[PDB]
Tab-separated table of C-alpha atoms and ligand atoms in Angstrom:
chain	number	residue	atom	x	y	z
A	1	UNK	CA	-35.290	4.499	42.539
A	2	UNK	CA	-40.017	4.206	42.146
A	3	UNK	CA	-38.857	7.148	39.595
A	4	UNK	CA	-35.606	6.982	37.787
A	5	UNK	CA	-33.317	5.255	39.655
B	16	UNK	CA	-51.541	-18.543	91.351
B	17	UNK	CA	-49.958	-15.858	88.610
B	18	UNK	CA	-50.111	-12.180	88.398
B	19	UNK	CA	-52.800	-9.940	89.399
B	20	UNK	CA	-55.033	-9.100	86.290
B	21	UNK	CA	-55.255	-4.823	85.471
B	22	UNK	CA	-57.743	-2.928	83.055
B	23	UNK	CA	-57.143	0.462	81.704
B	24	UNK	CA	-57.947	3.144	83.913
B	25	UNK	CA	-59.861	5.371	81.186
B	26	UNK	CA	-60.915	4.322	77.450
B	27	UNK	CA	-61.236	0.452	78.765
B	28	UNK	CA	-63.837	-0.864	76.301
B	29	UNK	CA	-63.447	1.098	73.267
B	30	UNK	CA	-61.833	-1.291	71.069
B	31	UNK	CA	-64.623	-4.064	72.375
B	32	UNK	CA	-67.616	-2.112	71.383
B	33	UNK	CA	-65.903	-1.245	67.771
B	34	UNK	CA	-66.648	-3.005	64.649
B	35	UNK	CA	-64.000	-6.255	64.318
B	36	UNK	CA	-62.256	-4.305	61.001
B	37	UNK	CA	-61.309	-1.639	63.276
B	38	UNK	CA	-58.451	-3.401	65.105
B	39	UNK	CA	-58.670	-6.734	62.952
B	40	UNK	CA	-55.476	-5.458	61.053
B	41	UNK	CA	-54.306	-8.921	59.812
B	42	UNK	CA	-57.534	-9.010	57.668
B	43	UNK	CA	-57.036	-5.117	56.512
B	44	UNK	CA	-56.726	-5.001	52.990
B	45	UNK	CA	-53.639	-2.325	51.842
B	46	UNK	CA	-55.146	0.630	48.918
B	47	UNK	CA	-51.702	0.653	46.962
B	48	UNK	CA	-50.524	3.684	45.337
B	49	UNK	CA	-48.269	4.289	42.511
B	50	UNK	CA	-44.692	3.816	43.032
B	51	UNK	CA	-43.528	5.960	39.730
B	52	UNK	CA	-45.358	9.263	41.548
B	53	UNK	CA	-42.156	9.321	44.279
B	54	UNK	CA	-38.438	9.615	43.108
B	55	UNK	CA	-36.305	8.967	46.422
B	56	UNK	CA	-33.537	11.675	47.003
B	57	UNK	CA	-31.403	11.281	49.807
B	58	UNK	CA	-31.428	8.176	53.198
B	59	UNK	CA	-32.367	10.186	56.250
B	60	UNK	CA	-31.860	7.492	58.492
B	61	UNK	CA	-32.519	4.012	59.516
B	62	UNK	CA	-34.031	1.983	62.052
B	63	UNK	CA	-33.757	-1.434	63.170
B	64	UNK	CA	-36.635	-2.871	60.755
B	65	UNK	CA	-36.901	0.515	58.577
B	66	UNK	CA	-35.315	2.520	55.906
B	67	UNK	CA	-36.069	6.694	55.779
B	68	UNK	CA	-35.829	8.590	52.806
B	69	UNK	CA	-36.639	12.127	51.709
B	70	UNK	CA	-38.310	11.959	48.247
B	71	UNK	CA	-40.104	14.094	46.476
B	72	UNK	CA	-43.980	13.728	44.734
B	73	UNK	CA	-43.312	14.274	41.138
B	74	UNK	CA	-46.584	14.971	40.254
B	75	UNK	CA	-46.788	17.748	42.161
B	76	UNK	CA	-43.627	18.848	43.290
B	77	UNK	CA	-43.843	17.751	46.586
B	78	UNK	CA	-41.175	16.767	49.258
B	79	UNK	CA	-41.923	13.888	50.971
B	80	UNK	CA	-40.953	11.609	53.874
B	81	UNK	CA	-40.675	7.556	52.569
B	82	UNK	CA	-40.401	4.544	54.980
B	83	UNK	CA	-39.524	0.728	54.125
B	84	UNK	CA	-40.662	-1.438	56.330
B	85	UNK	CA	-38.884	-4.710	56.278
B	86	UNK	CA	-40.363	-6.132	60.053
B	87	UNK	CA	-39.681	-10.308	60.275
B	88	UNK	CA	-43.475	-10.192	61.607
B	89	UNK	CA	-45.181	-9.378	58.151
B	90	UNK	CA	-47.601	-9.044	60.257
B	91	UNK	CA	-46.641	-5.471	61.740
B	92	UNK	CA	-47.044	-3.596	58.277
B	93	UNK	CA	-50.731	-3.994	58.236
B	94	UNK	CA	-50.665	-2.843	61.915
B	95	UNK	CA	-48.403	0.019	61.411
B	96	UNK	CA	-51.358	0.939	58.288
B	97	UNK	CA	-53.806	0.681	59.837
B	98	UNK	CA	-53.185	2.294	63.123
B	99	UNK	CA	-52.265	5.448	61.411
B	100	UNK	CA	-55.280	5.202	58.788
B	101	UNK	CA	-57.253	5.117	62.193
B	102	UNK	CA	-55.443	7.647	63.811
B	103	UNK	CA	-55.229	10.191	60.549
B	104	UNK	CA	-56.413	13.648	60.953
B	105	UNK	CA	-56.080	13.829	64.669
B	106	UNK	CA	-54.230	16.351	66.377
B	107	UNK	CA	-50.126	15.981	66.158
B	108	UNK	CA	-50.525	12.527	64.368
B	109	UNK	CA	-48.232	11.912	61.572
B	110	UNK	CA	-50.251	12.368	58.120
B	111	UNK	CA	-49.814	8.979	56.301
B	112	UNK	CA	-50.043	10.297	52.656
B	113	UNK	CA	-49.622	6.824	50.732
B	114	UNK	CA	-48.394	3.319	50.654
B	115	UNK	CA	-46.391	1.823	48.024
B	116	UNK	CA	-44.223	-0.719	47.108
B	117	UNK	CA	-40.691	-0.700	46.543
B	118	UNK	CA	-40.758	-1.535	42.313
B	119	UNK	CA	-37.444	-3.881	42.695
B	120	UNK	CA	-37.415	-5.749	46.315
B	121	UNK	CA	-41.443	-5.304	46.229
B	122	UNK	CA	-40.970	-4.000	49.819
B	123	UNK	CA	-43.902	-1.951	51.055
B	124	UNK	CA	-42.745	2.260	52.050
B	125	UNK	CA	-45.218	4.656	53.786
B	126	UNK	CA	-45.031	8.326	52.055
B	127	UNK	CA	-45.687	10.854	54.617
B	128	UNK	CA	-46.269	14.528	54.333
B	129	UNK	CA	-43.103	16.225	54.328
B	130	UNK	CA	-41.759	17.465	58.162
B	131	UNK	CA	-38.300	18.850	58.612
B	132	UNK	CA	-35.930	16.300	59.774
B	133	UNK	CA	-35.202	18.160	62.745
B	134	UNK	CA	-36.495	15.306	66.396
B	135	UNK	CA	-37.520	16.919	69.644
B	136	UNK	CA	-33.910	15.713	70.764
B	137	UNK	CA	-31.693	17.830	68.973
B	138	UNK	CA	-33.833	21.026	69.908
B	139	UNK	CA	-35.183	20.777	73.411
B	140	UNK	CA	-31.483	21.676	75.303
B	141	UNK	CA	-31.670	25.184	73.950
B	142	UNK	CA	-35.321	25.491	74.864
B	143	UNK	CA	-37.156	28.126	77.187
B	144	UNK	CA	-39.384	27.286	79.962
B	145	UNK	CA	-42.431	27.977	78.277
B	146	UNK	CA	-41.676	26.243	75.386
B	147	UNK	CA	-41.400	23.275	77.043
B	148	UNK	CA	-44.547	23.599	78.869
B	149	UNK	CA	-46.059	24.142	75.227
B	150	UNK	CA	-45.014	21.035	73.628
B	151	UNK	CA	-45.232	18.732	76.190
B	152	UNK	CA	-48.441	19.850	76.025
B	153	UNK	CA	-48.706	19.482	72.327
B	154	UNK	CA	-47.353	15.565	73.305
B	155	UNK	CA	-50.481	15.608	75.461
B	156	UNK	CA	-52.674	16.095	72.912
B	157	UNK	CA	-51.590	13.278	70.691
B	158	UNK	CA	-51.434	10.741	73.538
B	159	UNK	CA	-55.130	11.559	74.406
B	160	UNK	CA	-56.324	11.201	70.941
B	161	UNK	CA	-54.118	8.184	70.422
B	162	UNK	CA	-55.358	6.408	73.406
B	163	UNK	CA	-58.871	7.731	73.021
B	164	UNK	CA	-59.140	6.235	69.930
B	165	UNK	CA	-57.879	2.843	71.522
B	166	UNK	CA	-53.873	2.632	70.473
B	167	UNK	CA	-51.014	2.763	72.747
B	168	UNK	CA	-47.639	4.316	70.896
B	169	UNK	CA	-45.295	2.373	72.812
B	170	UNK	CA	-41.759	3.693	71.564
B	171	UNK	CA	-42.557	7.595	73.271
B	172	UNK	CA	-38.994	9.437	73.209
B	173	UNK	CA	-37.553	12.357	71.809
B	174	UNK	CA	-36.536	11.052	68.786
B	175	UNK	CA	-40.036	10.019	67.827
B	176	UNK	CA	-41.378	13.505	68.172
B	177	UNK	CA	-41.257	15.777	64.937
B	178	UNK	CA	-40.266	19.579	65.333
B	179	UNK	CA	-40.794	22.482	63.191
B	180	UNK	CA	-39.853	24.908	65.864
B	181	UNK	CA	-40.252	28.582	63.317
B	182	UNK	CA	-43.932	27.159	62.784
B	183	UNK	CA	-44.414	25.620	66.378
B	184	UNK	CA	-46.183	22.167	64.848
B	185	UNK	CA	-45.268	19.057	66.433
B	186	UNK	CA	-45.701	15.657	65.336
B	187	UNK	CA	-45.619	12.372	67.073
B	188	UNK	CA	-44.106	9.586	64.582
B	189	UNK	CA	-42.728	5.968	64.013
B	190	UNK	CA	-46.203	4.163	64.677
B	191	UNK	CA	-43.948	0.752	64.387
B	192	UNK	CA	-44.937	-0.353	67.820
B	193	UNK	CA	-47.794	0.690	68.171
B	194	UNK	CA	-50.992	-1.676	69.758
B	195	UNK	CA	-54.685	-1.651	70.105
B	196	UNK	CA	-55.834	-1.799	73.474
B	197	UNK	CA	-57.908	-4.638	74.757
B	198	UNK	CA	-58.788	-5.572	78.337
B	199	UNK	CA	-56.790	-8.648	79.478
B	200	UNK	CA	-54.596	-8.290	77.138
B	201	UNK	CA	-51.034	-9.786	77.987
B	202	UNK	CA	-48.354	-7.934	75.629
B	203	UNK	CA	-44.918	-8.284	74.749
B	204	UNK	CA	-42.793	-6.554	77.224
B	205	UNK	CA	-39.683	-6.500	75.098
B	206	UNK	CA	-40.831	-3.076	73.982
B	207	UNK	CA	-39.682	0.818	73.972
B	208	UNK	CA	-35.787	2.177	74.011
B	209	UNK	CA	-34.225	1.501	77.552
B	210	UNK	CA	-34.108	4.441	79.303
B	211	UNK	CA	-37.926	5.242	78.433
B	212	UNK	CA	-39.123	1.668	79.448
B	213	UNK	CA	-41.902	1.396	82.289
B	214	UNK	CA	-41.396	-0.358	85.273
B	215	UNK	CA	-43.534	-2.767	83.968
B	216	UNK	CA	-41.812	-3.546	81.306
B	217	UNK	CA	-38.834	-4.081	83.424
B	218	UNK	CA	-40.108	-6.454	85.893
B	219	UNK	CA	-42.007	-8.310	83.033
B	220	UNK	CA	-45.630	-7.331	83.639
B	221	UNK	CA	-47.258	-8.125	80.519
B	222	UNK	CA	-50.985	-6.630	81.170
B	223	UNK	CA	-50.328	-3.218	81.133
B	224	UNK	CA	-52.269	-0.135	78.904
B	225	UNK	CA	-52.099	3.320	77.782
B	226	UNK	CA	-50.083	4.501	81.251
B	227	UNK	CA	-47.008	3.237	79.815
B	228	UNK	CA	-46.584	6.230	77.271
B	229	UNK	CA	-47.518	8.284	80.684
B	230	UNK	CA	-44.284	6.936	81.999
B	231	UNK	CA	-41.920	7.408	78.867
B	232	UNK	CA	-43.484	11.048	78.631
B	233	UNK	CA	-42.310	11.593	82.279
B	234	UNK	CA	-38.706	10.625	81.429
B	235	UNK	CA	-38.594	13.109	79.060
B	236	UNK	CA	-39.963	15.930	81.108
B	237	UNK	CA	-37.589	14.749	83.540
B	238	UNK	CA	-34.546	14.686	81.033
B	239	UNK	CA	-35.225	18.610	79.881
B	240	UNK	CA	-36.600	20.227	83.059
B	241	UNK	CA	-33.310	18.797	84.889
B	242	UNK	CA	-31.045	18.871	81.663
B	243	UNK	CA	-29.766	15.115	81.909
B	244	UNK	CA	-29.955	12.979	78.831
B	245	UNK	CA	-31.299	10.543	79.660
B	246	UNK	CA	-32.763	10.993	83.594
B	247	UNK	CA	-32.578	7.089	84.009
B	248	UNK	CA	-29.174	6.053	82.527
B	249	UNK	CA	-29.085	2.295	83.104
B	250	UNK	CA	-26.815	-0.015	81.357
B	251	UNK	CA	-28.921	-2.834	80.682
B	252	UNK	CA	-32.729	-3.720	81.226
B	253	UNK	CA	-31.941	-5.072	85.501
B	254	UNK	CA	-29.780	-2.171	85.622
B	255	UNK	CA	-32.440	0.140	84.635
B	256	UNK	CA	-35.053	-0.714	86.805
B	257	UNK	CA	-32.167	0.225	90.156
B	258	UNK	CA	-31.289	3.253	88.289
B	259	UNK	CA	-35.625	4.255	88.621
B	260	UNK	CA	-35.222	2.905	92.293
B	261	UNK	CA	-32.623	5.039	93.338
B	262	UNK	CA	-34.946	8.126	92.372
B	263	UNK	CA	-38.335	6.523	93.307
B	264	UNK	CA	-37.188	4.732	96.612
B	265	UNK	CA	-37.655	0.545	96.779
B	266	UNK	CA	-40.820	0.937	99.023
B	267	UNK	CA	-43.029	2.053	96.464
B	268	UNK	CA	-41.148	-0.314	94.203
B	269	UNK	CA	-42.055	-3.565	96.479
B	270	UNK	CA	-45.474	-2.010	97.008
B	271	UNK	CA	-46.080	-2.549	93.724
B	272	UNK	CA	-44.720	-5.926	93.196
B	273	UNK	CA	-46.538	-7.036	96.253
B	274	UNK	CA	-50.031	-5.650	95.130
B	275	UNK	CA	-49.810	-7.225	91.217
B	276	UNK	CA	-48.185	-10.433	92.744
B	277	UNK	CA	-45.035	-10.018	90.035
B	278	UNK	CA	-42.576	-12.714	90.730
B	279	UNK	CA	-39.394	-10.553	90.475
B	280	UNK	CA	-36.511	-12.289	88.332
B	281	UNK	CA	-34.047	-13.746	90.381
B	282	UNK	CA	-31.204	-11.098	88.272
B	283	UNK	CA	-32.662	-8.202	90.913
B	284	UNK	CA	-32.062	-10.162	94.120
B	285	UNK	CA	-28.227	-9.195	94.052
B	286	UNK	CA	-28.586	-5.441	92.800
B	287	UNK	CA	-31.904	-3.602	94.051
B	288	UNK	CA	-31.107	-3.571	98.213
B	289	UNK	CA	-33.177	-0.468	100.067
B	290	UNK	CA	-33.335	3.119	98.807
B	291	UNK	CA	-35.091	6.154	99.938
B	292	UNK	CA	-37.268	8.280	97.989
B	293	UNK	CA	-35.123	11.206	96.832
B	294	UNK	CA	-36.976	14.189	96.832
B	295	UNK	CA	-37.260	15.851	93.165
B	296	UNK	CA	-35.505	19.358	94.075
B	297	UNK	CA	-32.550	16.836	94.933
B	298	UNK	CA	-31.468	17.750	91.302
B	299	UNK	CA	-32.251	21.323	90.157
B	300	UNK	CA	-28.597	23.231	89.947
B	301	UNK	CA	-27.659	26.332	88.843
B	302	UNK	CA	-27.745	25.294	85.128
B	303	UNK	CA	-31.844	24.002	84.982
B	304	UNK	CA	-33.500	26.301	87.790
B	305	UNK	CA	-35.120	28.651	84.876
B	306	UNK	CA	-36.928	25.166	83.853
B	307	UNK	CA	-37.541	23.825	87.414
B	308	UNK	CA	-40.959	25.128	89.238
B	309	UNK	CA	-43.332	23.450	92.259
B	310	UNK	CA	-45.940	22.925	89.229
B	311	UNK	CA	-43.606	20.866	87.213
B	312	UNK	CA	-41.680	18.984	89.987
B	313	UNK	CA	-45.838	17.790	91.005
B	314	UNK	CA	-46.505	17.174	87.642
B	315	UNK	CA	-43.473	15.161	87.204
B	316	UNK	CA	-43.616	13.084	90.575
B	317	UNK	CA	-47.656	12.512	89.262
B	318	UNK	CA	-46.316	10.284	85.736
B	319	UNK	CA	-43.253	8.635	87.093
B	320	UNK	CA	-45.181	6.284	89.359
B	321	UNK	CA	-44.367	2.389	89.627
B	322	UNK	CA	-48.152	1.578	89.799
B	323	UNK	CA	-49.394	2.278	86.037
B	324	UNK	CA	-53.092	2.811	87.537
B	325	UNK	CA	-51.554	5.771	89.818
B	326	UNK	CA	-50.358	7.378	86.636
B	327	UNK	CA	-52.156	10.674	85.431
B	328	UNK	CA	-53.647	9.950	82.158
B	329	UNK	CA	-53.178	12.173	79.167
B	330	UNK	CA	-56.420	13.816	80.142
B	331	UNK	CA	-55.727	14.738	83.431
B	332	UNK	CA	-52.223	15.701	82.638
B	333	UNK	CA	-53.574	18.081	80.445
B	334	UNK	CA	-55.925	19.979	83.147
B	335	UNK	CA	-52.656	20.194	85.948
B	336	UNK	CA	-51.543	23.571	86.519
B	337	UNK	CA	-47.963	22.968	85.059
B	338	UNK	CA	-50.028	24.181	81.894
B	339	UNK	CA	-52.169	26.971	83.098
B	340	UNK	CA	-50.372	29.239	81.251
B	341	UNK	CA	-50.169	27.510	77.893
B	342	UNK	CA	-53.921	26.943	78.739
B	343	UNK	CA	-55.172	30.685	78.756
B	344	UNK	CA	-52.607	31.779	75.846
B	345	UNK	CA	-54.282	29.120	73.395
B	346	UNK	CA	-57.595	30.524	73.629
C	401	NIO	O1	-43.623	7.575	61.241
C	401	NIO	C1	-42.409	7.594	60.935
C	401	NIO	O2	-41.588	6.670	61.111
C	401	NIO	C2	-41.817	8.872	60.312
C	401	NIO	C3	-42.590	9.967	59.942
C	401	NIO	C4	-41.975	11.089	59.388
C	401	NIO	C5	-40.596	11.085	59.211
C	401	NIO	N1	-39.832	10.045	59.551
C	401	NIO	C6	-40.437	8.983	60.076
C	402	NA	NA1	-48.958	-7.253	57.527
């Protein structure tokens, strides 16, 4: 989550 | 006939003679960052129209605060922006580092600069004297810049004031509520946490300024100085405003109603009746005379006025003896 998740 | 119309005391006309884009945040147009430069870590908490989460800058290795904001008033993210793009760099103001948008729900997050999740509530019981004095001066600071630069907080508590007590940096967040200040200007009223609301809030005076943050800062001297959290402890908005009355008195009270011509709901007629002033040293004890002086019980009975216009402002605050001492140290 914005990255990975 | 209506209300009696009131104008700002000090910094009256700056918004006027600024260019429209200055306060014209509807038309403000959002510089997006990058989304994939944040990985969020852990929820630190949540408001009402907001969701907190530590995070950390991957391309640099950062920690960072991020914010959703999910407001029903689109409207408020662009103000939110841009009163802390206006505000950035001044003293004790939240750094906004970026803005990006949530990749899935497409919801727009503020990344801050990274401050330890640690509020001015959870640290100012164990305080000593002077370190009060020292950060409600630091408070100062912000408010004057804030409202010299044409921006009333609005939402000015404890939990909205940023701590790193080993470093001794403050910082004055959640910008959510935050307005521009114009003359004439009737705003919403439905504003603040309870205990911190002005009494023109309460009795639904809509054309009030920056003196309202000068009221909400004097409930939280008031709440450390005396230890009582919170000083005003009403149950609802009508009881609120007799909780202030049985400290203040009902003569200023009706003073005040009488000189802005505020038609006083109907709700109050059963529950205000007649109070006397109580004198401030009516609540030192045992337990909060090391915080309780004749400088701060003046300073204090100088910010929790009815009348916003007899309020100190920020600036003259600053220069009362309460912070003499903090004063000559700093330099
Ligand atoms: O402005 C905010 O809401 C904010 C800033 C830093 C940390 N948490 C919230
Ligand atoms: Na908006």
């Amino acid at each position: 989550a914005x990255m990975v998740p | 006939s209506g209300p009696v119309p009131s104008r700002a005391r000090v910094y009256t006309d700056v918004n006027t003679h600024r260019p429209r884009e200055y306060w014209d945040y509807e038309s403000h147009v959002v510089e997006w960052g990058n989304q994939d430069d944040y990985q969020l870590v852990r929820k630190l908490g949540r408001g009402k129209y907001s969701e907190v989460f530590e995070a950390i800058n991957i391309t640099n290795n950062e920690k960072v605060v991020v914010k959703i904001l999910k407001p029903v008033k689109k409207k408020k993210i662009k103000r939110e922006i841009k009163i802390l793009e206006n505000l950035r760099g001044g003293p004790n103001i939240i750094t906004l580092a970026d803005i990006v948008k949530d990749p899935v729900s497409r919801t727009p997050a503020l990344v801050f600069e990274h401050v330890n999740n640690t509020d001015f509530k959870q640290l100012y019981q164990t305080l000593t004297d002077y370190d009060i004095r020292f950060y409600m001066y630091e408070i100062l600071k912000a408010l004057d810049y804030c409202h010299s630069m044409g921006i009333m907080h609005r939402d000015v508590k404890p939990h909205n004031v940023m701590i790193d007590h080993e470093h001794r940096k403050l910082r004055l967040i959640d910008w959510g509520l935050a307005e521009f200040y114009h003359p004439g200007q009737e705003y919403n009223v439905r504003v603040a946490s309870r205990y911190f609301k002005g009494p023109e809030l309460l009795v639904d005076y809509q054309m009030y300024d920056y003196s309202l943050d000068m009221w909400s800062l004097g409930c939280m001297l008031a709440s450390m100085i005396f230890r009582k959290e919170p000083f005003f402890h009403g149950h609802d908005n009508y009881d609120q405003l007799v909780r202030i009355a049985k400290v203040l008195g009902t003569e200023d009270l009706y003073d005040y109603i009488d000189k802005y011509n505020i038609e006083l709901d109907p709700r109050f007629n059963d529950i205000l009746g007649r109070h006397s002033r109580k004198r401030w040293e009516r609540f030192v004890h045992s337990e909060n005379q090391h915080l309780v002086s004749p400088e701060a019980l003046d300073f204090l009975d100088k910010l929790l006025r009815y009348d916003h216009q007899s309020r100190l402002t920020a600036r003259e605050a600053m220069e009362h003896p309460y912070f003499y001492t903090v004063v000559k140290d700093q330099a």
